[PDB]
From a paper:
Perforin-2 (MPEG1) is thought to enable the killing of invading microbes engulfed by macrophages and other phagocytes, forming pores in their membranes. Perforin-2 (PFN2) has recently been identified as a novel and critically important component of innate immunity conserved throughout the animal kingdom and evolutionarily close to the last common ancestor of the MAC and perforin-1 (7, 10). Because of the presence of a canonical MAC-perforin (MACPF) domain, PFN2 has been proposed to form functional pores in bacterial membranes, leading to bacterial death and control of infection. However, unlike MAC components and perforin-1, PFN2 is initially synthesized as a type I transmembrane protein and found associated with the membranes of intracellular vesicles in which its large ectodomain (consisting mainly of the MACPF domain and a unique P2 domain characteristic of PFN2) projects into the lumen.
We determined structures of the P2 domain in isolation by x-ray crystallography in two crystal forms, with two crystallographically distinct copies in space group P21 at 2.05 Å and eight copies in space group P1 at 3.17 Å. The resolution of the peripheral P2 domain is relatively low in the cryo–electron microscopy (cryo-EM) structure, and in particular, an extended β-hairpin region was not well resolved. However, by determining a structure of the P2 domain in isolation by x-ray crystallography (at 2.05 Å resolution), we were able to build an atomic model for the whole complex into the cryo-EM map. Liposomes containing phosphatidylcholine (PC) and phosphatidylethanolamine (PE) showed no sedimentation of the P2 domain. When adding to these base lipids increasing concentrations of phosphatidylserine (PS) from 5 to 30%, the binding efficiency was gradually enhanced. Given that negatively charged lipids such as cardiolipin, Escherichia coli total lipid extracts, and LPS from E. coli and Salmonella enterica are characteristic of major bacterial membrane lipid species, we also tested and confirmed preferential binding of the P2 domain to these lipids. In contrast, the P2 domain showed almost no binding to liposomes containing sphingomyelin, which is a neutrally charged lipid found in animal cell membranes. Truncating the β hairpin (residues Y427-V452) within the P2 domain (P2Δhairpin mutant) abolished its binding to PS, cardiolipin, and E. coli lipids, confirming the role of this region in membrane binding by PFN2. Thus, membrane binding seems to be conferred exclusively by the tip region of the P2 domain β hairpin.
Author numbering: 376 to 539, 548 to 579
The structure:
């Protein structure tokens, strides 16, 4: 099975502080898209809210004619929508280009491939959802050492098209199902080869 990457779009809803950390381009395309011959699979769309301190200035006046400005940190709420995708081969189309898969982890979970909140050596962490990191690499000769076969993603709203169109929330063939994250009550899982 070939892995065409993941990506994540973002739209600011109040403030403009969040999409910097929420948006994630696809390594393979330079954009929020899938390589030719791959299909975007929409895993999830949700809004992230966050409290932050914004610097603001305000004028206090005595009799509207003697005025002074003061600037302070003020507590505000930032909100933004993220829309999460992964890329799956619709057909065999042109090969062998695709990404090596090196596990996933969050700020509060651990990556079974490396047993650390990290990716294997030479791998890039890509942002997905609010805090998931997806470990990815492009160099087969150094990556395959640290790569596990990848069997797809699926979520509470979207099945896994690699199962063998019907989109079943399942893992294909000889792959085992593992929980990635629960994002605002929505389950997101991934599939890897049977193993510890
Ligand atoms: Cl949802």
């Amino acid at each position: 099975f070939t892995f065409g990457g993941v990506y994540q779009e973002c739209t600011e809803l109040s403030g403009d502080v969040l999409c910097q950390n929420l948006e994630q381009k696809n390594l393979l395309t330079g954009d929020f898209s899938c390589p030719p011959g791959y299909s975007p699979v929409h895993l999830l769309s949700q809004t992230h809210e966050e409290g932050y301190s914004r610097l603001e200035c305000k004028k206090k006046c005595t009799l509207k004619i003697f005025c002074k400005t003061v600037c302070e940190d003020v507590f505000r709420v930032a909100k933004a929508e993220f829309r999460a995708y992964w890329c799956v081969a619709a057909g065999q189309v042109p090969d062998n280009s695709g990404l090596l898969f090196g596990g996933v982890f969050t700020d509060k979970t651990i990556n079974p491939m490396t047993n650390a909140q990290s990716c294997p050596a030479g791998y890039i962490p890509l942002n997905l959802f609010e805090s998931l990191k997806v470990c990815v690499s492009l160099d087969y000769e150094l990556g395959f050492k640290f790569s596990v076969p990848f069997g797809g993603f699926f979520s509470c709203i979207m099945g896994n098209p690699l199962v063998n169109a019907p989109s079943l929330k399942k893992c294909p063939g000889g792959f085992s199902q593992h929980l990635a994250v629960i994002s605002d009550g929505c389950q997101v899982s991934y599939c890897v080869k049977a193993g510890i």
